[PDB]
């Protein structure tokens, strides 16, 4: 079972810049990271990660 | 009187009951008999440089033309039923690639060729379920079909 603890999604600071994105012809964006937990229904090993 | 074509094919499929393992073993024996008989005929074709007549083929098996022809028929029907009752498996595997370049109906018809080959190479003596051997051939046929028919400039 995969659980997406979506209330804790963090956001990575934008790379480049607004002006750098404009002058480079790129995109102004951030990266989204959500913590998740894979739960084995039997063994019960939970490998928490982002 | 529906206009959908896939649903009509699914209904036509559902009019056929799934085989049981003993039924698979029984059909596998008749399929092997048909294969051996076909190999022999192929030998007659090499010897005659022409299609052997049923009488010459029956003569090659030291079999009365009636007995031989009925055996041939039984084998044909056995292979037909083995493929027919597993088309549901073909659809079940083919539904897992419906967004790769081939339409769903194309995936089904290309996996049918793999099912036919699997039914031609299934060994009852191995002691395994036909649904395990057939999956490999169905998957291979569908993957090859995608590799050879999904793009206009084929890679």
């Amino acid at each position: 079972e995969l659980h997406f603890l979506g209330k804790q999604y963090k956001l990575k600071r934008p790379k480049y810049d607004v002006d750098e994105a404009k002058r480079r012809d790129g995109t102004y964006s951030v990266q989204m990271y959500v913590p998740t937990r894979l739960i084995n229904k039997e063994t019960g090993e939970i490998k928490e990660q982002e | 009187y529906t206009e959908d074509s896939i649903r009509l094919y699914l209904q036509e499929i559902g009019r056929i009951r799934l085989l049981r393992a003993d039924e698979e073993i029984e059909l596998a024996r008749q399929i092997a008999d048909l294969l051996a008989l076909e190999r022999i005929r192929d030998e007659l074709l090499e010897q005659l440089d022409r299609l052997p007549s049923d009488a010459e083929w029956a003569a090659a098996v030291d079999s009365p033309l009636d007995e031989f022809r009925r055996r041939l028929f039984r084998g044909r029907r056995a292979k037909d039923k083995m493929v027919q009752s597993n088309l549901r498996l073909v659809v079940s595997i083919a539904k897992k690639y419906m967004n790769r370049g081939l339409s769903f109906q194309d995936l089904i018809q290309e996996g049918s060729l793999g099912l036919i080959r699997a039914a031609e190479k299934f060994d009852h003596e191995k002691g395994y379920k036909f649904s395990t051997y057939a999956t490999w051939w169905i998957r291979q046929a569908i993957t090859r079909a995608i590799a050879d028919q999904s793009r206009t400039i084929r890679l």
Binding site: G44 | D22, I25, E125, G127
Partner: protein, 577 residues
Amino acid sequence: LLPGAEPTVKNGDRVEVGDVLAETKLTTERGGTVRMGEDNGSSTHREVEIIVVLDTATVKAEASQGREHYVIETKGGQRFNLLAAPGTKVTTGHVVAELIDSRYRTQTGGLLKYSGVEISKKGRAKAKQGYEVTKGGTLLWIPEETHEVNKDISLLNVEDGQLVEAGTEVVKDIFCQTTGIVSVTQNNDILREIVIKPGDVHVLDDPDTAAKYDEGRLVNAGEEVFPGLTAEQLVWAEAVDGTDGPLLLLRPVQELVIPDEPPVPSQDSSQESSSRSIRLRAVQRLQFQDGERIKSVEGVDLLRTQLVLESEEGSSQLSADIELLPDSKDPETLRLQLVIIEPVVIRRDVASDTTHGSTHTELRVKDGQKVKPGAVIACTQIQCKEAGVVRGIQEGSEAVRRLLVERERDCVTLDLDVTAATQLQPGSLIVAGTQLVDGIIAPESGEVRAIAPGQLQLRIARPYRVSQGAVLHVEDKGLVQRGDNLVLLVFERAKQGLPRIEELLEARKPKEACILARRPGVAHINYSDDDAIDIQVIEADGTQADYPVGPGQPLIISDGETVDAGQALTDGPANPH
């Protein structure tokens, strides 16, 4: 007035501000115990619940593999597992808890025999739920290990009747788990069923002893199975055909004794005010019938002891929520409880122009109180915003939906001479601007309330003219508020671009096609009783045509009495086709 609201006053009752006009009474349908919801930031309970209770156990919530399972420890030390989670509603008959038992759990499959044990014969569909025991007794368990496969013959490794040890690969990729004799079933070169049965084997020398054990038999402890052979404990002796011929097999029979009544203490309901008591009945179920030949490689559970929700007859349709009550003496100790909660919803007080009065709901009971069915739970009273007189409440067979309060500012006094105004009566309808007396003209319209010496009381009023044929949306002495549609007036009236040109050029049939004649004649309008206006024309010989005008929209324009073929009769565009 809200649905079900009943006015508390009669017509003419002079009320004051805040006094009760109408009330809505909420009553308990079936009675029980009052349960007040906690004041969750509200001093008004928006819902009150109706409640029997059972507590005399202990319950602990333990977490195993991330699952919160509830263990019910009885005062006798027995343990139950709670199969039903908190917040779940279950009807009568549903299993709530399962006895945590291992004695009646077999190691492998086998055969089952009854000894005095009796069960209820109600329902085959409950077979999956087991068989309720009506009398305890003894279960005889004859072990065996059955591998059911549908594989070909040439995969076989072991002979029919070979005495084997456990672990031998009897069939390719199949491993025996019991040390015994293997009996093999095949159908047309296809392996179907393999049987391994434990127990001592012995040579069969005398055919008569084998004939005695032809069908298999039970033999008790110490009883001599055959001369020189005494069974040390109860065993099942059957004759089997091994590799060399007859042999006697002594399979070890197990005995499981079940008491007549499940000795698990029931917990008693504590409230008498519930005329339909609810309780937990403990039942014993055997999952298999007598002589049921069971084929299973792994062990099975034979007997299950289950707590089951039971209620008095007539309450079968009731569904009980399942809750945990923290004990008053020890809050830590929780106790399982079943409630037949009945809800009563309290609406919040609204005083802002919904009823245009303040609706205030007061409870008639207290938390924990015992109420009989039908007892009044809450009274919502509507309080009048302005004093005056109550009217408009008609009597008989209909729910009072609206009332009227005539206030102090809906009456005006005017200084008029009584002596000559004698032509007027209290309750007359005075149109404003009408000369009431010589030199005296009505300033404002209204209803004549009273005629005092030198003074006149007018209740403000306003007319609306209505002509013949209008549609009335209202009734005499009704009640209407601002904006309500009074009446639909029906009257008459009388008096082109690209669509017309496109319709003409495309030779389309105009919707409102004028009626066209087909022969010269005279034009009898023929105003019938039902206004069946039909244009009957008399031919040159005297043949009628009977053109029906139809609805009112095709207005007639034809009265020439000189019509000719093709001549139009009504308003609108002619159809050229």
